[PDB]
Design a protein around this motif. Structure first.
Motif, PDB file in Angstrom:
ATOM      1  N   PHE A   1      35.731  39.163  47.695  1.00  0.00           N
ATOM      2  CA  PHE A   1      34.764  38.725  48.692  1.00  0.00           C
ATOM      3  C   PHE A   1      33.537  39.622  48.740  1.00  0.00           C
ATOM      4  O   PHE A   1      32.497  39.201  49.256  1.00  0.00           O
TER       5      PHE A   1
ATOM      6  N   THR B   1      27.264  37.399  46.098  1.00  0.00           N
ATOM      7  CA  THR B   1      26.617  36.139  45.794  1.00  0.00           C
ATOM      8  C   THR B   1      26.984  35.699  44.382  1.00  0.00           C
ATOM      9  O   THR B   1      27.109  36.538  43.485  1.00  0.00           O
TER      10      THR B   1
ATOM     11  N   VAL C   1      40.557  34.574  35.384  1.00  0.00           N
ATOM     12  CA  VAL C   1      39.907  34.780  36.673  1.00  0.00           C
ATOM     13  C   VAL C   1      40.974  35.076  37.718  1.00  0.00           C
ATOM     14  O   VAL C   1      42.035  34.440  37.738  1.00  0.00           O
TER      15      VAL C   1
ATOM     16  N   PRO D   1      39.877  35.510  45.104  1.00  0.00           N
ATOM     17  CA  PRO D   1      38.904  34.568  45.667  1.00  0.00           C
ATOM     18  C   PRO D   1      37.516  35.173  45.724  1.00  0.00           C
ATOM     19  O   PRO D   1      37.344  36.364  45.452  1.00  0.00           O
TER      20      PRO D   1
ATOM     21  N   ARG E   1      33.972  33.295  41.263  1.00  0.00           N
ATOM     22  CA  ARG E   1      35.120  33.039  40.400  1.00  0.00           C
ATOM     23  C   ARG E   1      34.755  32.081  39.270  1.00  0.00           C
ATOM     24  O   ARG E   1      35.207  32.247  38.131  1.00  0.00           O
ATOM     25  N   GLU E   2      33.943  31.067  39.566  1.00  0.00           N
ATOM     26  CA  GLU E   2      33.477  30.130  38.551  1.00  0.00           C
ATOM     27  C   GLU E   2      32.088  30.452  38.022  1.00  0.00           C
ATOM     28  O   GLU E   2      31.825  30.224  36.838  1.00  0.00           O
TER      29      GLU E   2
ATOM     30  N   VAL F   1      32.273  32.640  35.046  1.00  0.00           N
ATOM     31  CA  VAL F   1      32.751  31.965  33.845  1.00  0.00           C
ATOM     32  C   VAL F   1      31.633  31.157  33.201  1.00  0.00           C
ATOM     33  O   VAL F   1      31.516  31.116  31.971  1.00  0.00           O
TER      34      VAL F   1
ATOM     35  N   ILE G   1      41.157  28.716  30.556  1.00  0.00           N
ATOM     36  CA  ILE G   1      40.765  29.315  31.828  1.00  0.00           C
ATOM     37  C   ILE G   1      41.990  29.334  32.730  1.00  0.00           C
ATOM     38  O   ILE G   1      42.590  28.283  32.990  1.00  0.00           O
ATOM     39  N   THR G   2      42.357  30.521  33.211  1.00  0.00           N
ATOM     40  CA  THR G   2      43.574  30.704  33.990  1.00  0.00           C
ATOM     41  C   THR G   2      43.285  31.518  35.243  1.00  0.00           C
ATOM     42  O   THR G   2      42.567  32.521  35.192  1.00  0.00           O
ATOM     43  N   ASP G   3      43.854  31.085  36.366  1.00  0.00           N
ATOM     44  CA  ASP G   3      43.784  31.817  37.624  1.00  0.00           C
ATOM     45  C   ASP G   3      45.017  32.703  37.739  1.00  0.00           C
ATOM     46  O   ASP G   3      46.145  32.201  37.763  1.00  0.00           O
TER      47      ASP G   3
ATOM     48  N   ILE H   1      49.997  36.166  44.184  1.00  0.00           N
ATOM     49  CA  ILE H   1      50.499  35.494  45.378  1.00  0.00           C
ATOM     50  C   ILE H   1      51.798  36.165  45.803  1.00  0.00           C
ATOM     51  O   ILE H   1      52.815  36.045  45.105  1.00  0.00           O
ATOM     52  N   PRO H   2      51.806  36.907  46.907  1.00  0.00           N
ATOM     53  CA  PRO H   2      53.074  37.423  47.428  1.00  0.00           C
ATOM     54  C   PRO H   2      53.970  36.280  47.869  1.00  0.00           C
ATOM     55  O   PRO H   2      53.501  35.259  48.375  1.00  0.00           O
TER      56      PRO H   2
END
Lengths: 153, 55, 118
Positions: free
Chosen positions: C16, C48, C75, C78, C82-83, C86, C99-101, C105-106
């Motif tokens: 962020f 930005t 990537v 958040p 993020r895009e 790329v 392209i992979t996120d 994630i807990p």
RNA sequence: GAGUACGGUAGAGGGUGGUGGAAUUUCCUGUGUAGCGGUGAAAUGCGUAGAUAUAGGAAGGAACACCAGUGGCGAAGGCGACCACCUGGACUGAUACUGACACUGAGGUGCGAAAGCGUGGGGAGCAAACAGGAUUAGAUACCCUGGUAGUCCACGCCGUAAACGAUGUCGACUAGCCGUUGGGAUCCUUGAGAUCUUAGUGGCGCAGCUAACGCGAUAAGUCGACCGCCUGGGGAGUACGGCCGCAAGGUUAAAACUCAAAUGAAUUGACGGGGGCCCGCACAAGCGGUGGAGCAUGUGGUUUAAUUCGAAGCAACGCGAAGA
């Protein structure tokens, strides 16, 4: 807020060159509604431009205004509780008007004898792209291309 | 959250499929919810309102 | 020097507040990296998407000196960029295989901090 | 009515041990080079002793993403990873059995979130206190960076919560409509829906009740059994005494004095640093100004013998005065 369509004013072409583009230039250099006084300036200015090089004083006017009219400009804009100067493109109706703005304003502050040869002095000094009005154009262009981060409207 | 670019397509449509996979998995919503700790009272109060809106 | 690596992996640590792009090999050995805060964007401009692509483009050309033409995009996190980072990798010479996120994630693990009472 | 015998069903019901994945943190190693982190913006902080990022490995603790659902279980408080062991209850079908064995319940006894307390372990994240950085007139806060108790485990103690459905338990009756969980019966044997019935769990709604809001077969309607509690607000759930507690405190529980009201619901208006829609030189874009200078006018103040009186934000100050 407003709902008005404002008004669509029309300008008649100049009597000595047959170009409405000079009409709004005449319309811009006005002071106190003295139409006859100001038109003596431009024609004397155009005679000075024609007498010093070039072939037609009307075509170098065309050459002058594009070098003055910016292609982009920021405006104060509040979205997230803060002011973001979003660069916006200048519409064709506004770019030439603001081109006519900055020619007279910076020539009015010049050190030459009279405006008759002072707007004329800037006219060629701006047509080649090395004048203060040209200088004012690029710093506005410098204002944008740095605030390019904000591109949401 | 994982796409493979195939032959003879523009990379633009490869991006649009990518985020379409992202919101399908909902990874952005999951990380938003785990940004800060929601107390069990606030979590149960949110889910009760969710059930009311659904009905 | 020139490692002469043909296949690489690009990581975008989008957050962020900042976006860190890192180009690495298939075994995780970094070659070049750039950040939004390292590209003259400080404060409101660091968060930005335009600053993100500048970071990606700056690290993108620094990575061609290794002779890299193929990379996979990883990537993670958040944030605004993020895009947009790329899309910067496409402007410079590259083809993206995938392209992979990889955002962590807990599974309801460690307790996150408290709500900000702003 | 209440209960027992049998088959079956669902369940985060409880207890005791193992096991798994994601993630965080810490440490080790490789790559790699100027930032990372944070915020409204910053700064404290971390980093050239090589940070963040990235890859490989290791340790450790805590909670169990998706499933997940006005879903389920429990007397309530509560209970969410998986498996094994121990164990309570509920629901469901028929037959069989006892035959009022029931309900409620002052005392009493047991359980009882979180915080807290004691002994011993454990400690990743979070975080009272504490420290520093910001903001602010100040900021013992909100925000940021750290961070101790605590949060976790075992054994004890406490015994309080907006422990709430602000609605004691038990039994019977009173139109319906639309969902959902666990069963059962019949049509459909359907492949696959429909109709009844039961125990829960929700949303509307006739009657009825209600001060109104609303409740309305999960009643706040019509009754019956029993219990607990209230008698204006403050003083005050306080003092004193008793009991309990290691303590913090809990429980039981006044009076003097003082006030003529506190209070609930609803209506109109007004307001909101609530929301939606719209307008006005209100904003935006420009034209020219005031505020800087000299002069004219009025006002305040001062002075005077009087400097006549009134007008005082917008909506008084070239105003009554269209002329000392």
């Amino acid at each position: 807020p407003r709902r008005r369509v404002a008004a669509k004013r029309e300008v008649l072409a100049d009597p000595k060159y047959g170009s409405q583009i000079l009409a709004k230039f005449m319309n811009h250099v006005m002071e106190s509604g003295k139409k006859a006084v100001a038109e003596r300036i431009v024609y004397g200015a155009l005679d000075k431009v024609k007498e010093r090089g070039k072939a037609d004083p009307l075509e170098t006017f065309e050459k002058a205004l594009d070098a003055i009219a910016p292609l982009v400009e920021v405006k104060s804009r509040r979205v997230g509780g803060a002011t973001y100067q979003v660069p916006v493109e200048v519409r064709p109706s506004r770019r030439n008007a603001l081109a006519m703005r900055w020619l007279v304003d910076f020539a009015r502050k010049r050190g030459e004898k009279s405006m008759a040869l002072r707007l004329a002095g800037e006219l060629l000094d701006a047509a080649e792209g090395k004048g203060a009005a040209v200088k004012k154009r690029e710093d506005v262009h410098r204002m944008a291309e740095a605030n390019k981060a904000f591109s949401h409207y | 959250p994982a796409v493979k670019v195939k032959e003879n397509e523009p990379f633009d449509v490869a991006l649009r499929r990518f985020k379409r996979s992202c919101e399908k998995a909902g990874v952005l919503a999951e990380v938003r919810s785990r940004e800060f700790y929601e107390k069990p009272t606030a979590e149960r109060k949110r889910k009760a309102a969710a059930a009311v809106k659904r009905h | 020097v020139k490692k002469t690596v043909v296949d690489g992996i690009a990581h975008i640590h989008a957050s962020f507040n900042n976006t860190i792009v890192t180009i690495t090999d298939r075994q995780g050995n970094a070659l070049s990296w750039a950040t939004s805060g390292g590209s003259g964007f400080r404060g409101s401009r660091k968060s930005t998407p335009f600053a993100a692509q500048v970071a990606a483009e700056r690290a993108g050309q620094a990575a061609l000196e290794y002779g890299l033409k193929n990379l996979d995009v990883n990537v993670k996190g958040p944030g605004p960029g993020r895009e947009s980072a790329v899309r910067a990798l496409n402007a410079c010479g590259y083809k993206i295989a995938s392209i992979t996120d990889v955002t962590p994630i807990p599974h309801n693990g460690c307790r996150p901090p408290k709500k900000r009472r702003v």
